[PDB]
Design a protein around this ligand. Structure first.
Ligand SMILES: O=C(Nc1ccc(C2=NCCN2)cc1)c1ccc(C(=O)Nc2ccc(-c3ncc[nH]3)cc2)c([N+](=O)[O-])c1
Ligand SMILES: O=C(Nc1ccc(C2=NCCN2)cc1)c1ccc(C(=O)Nc2ccc(-c3ncc[nH]3)cc2)c([N+](=O)[O-])c1
Lengths: 211, 217
């Protein structure tokens, strides 16, 4: 059973170019593909879906999400934004906080949207926290272990990441999740993100089920 | 940079158990064939301009015996101008073994050819945590402020930070996963998975991985 899937959603700009259209067109097709993947995961009992918007700008991508919130809530989706939003404009930060709190109680799919996220950043923010605790004398350097750092990195309340999918044909993690992908299956496909569809997602889930 | 572009390659060497099973042999024959394949890869990397090779002995099918085995290769590595380092938590290793590791490292530290890093009782999470503990000690002595901690600083405290970043990770044996080998250090690395079992992975396979990295960037 695959409980938590993460996807690096690459290929929207390459897709636009192949279609003979401006980069913007590729965003809008990428957004359709977001909806389809979120629906498919919610329909197939996946617990958590973590989406990294990446292209081989982040504010705006989050803005575009703002109008989907009412629909996600109605579908019992818990929405979280992961990543360093602390320099986003304060109006956007308030909307993120409002959407997360609206849905925080939902018990269906948890959808994590990584915004201005980096795996090294995620670890460093958790290390900064431990460092504050040591300085305040609340923690001995030496009590620090994997389990404790794990509690200070993103998504520690969710099932571990079982499967990472990257569309778009590159074979890297690109500083998406690092700590959390120690034991995840890595599935790379040349399909571009706007084309990735239910059969492609099932293909990735077979890879997991075979292993 | 060599034409392939790769300064540091890391290899998850899986498949030795499977290879021995396919032949009707016990696991020890797979380990001896896997050792032949290490010598061959080390020789290939050294002849191909690679700066650093990092090897993670892993079977999908103890750690301390692997490192005893390596102790018998140290003279030969030295003779081939290889600089040898062990990465991993060896602090609970047999006291004799820890002294043999130290001396093999000191013996070859002057070498100018390939740098070979052998992971022994290594895990990517462990490596991040030991880096974090060195930082927390500096905070507890009043030398470091929590707010001065950034990526660059934590980078300076994980294994291999003084070598070229890892450009390419090869995993043999058919599984598509990192299995808690390098994690901080592979943020930008090319990942190359091949179904070839470790004992069968030969120069043409290694050339093929390098040229796939060169072609993909
Ligand atoms: O990325 C999105 N929108 C978007 C639009 C435009 C752009 C854009 N960039 C600049 C040019 N256009 C970017 C992103 C997007 C779209 C739909 C959705 C979304 O999931 N909608 C949605 C609504 C309902 C359901 C659903 N159905 C069953 C259970 N859940 C599933 C999905 C999300 N999302 O995360 O939720 C983001
Ligand atoms: O893993 C190794 N040996 C080994 C043997 C047995 C076992 C074993 N485990 C349980 C059963 N037996 C495990 C490991 C091994 C073998 C050779 C080497 C090795 O690289 N030796 C070497 C020696 C010489 C040269 C060389 N010299 C000049 C041309 N090239 C190149 C490489 C290494 N190594 O890390 O360097 C490990």
């Amino acid at each position: 059973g695959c409980r938590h899937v993460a996807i690096i959603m690459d290929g929207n700009g390459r897709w636009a170019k192949k279609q003979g259209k401006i980069r913007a067109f590729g965003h809008k097709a990428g957004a359709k593909s977001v909806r389809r993947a979120v629906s498919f995961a919610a329909n197939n009992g996946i617990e958590a879906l973590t989406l990294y918007a990446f292209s081989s700008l982040m504010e705006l991508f989050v803005w575009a999400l703002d109008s989907e919130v009412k629909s996600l809530h109605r579908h019992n989706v818990r929405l979280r934004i992961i990543g360093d939003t602390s320099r986003f404009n304060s109006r956007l930060q308030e909307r993120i906080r409002k959407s997360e709190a609206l849905t925080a109680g939902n018990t269906g799919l948890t959808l994590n949207i990584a915004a201005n996220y980096g795996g090294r950043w995620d670890i460093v923010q958790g290390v900064r926290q431990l460092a504050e605790k040591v300085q305040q004398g609340n923690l001995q350097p030496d009590q620090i272990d994997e389990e404790m750092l794990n509690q200070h990195v993103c998504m520690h309340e969710l099932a571990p990441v079982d499967l990472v999918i990257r569309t778009g044909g590159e074979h890297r993690i690109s500083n998406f999740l690092l700590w959390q992908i120690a034991y995840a299956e890595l599935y790379f496909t040349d399909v571009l993100w706007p084309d990735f569809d239910e059969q492609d997602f099932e293909g990735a889930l077979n890879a997991f089920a075979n292993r």
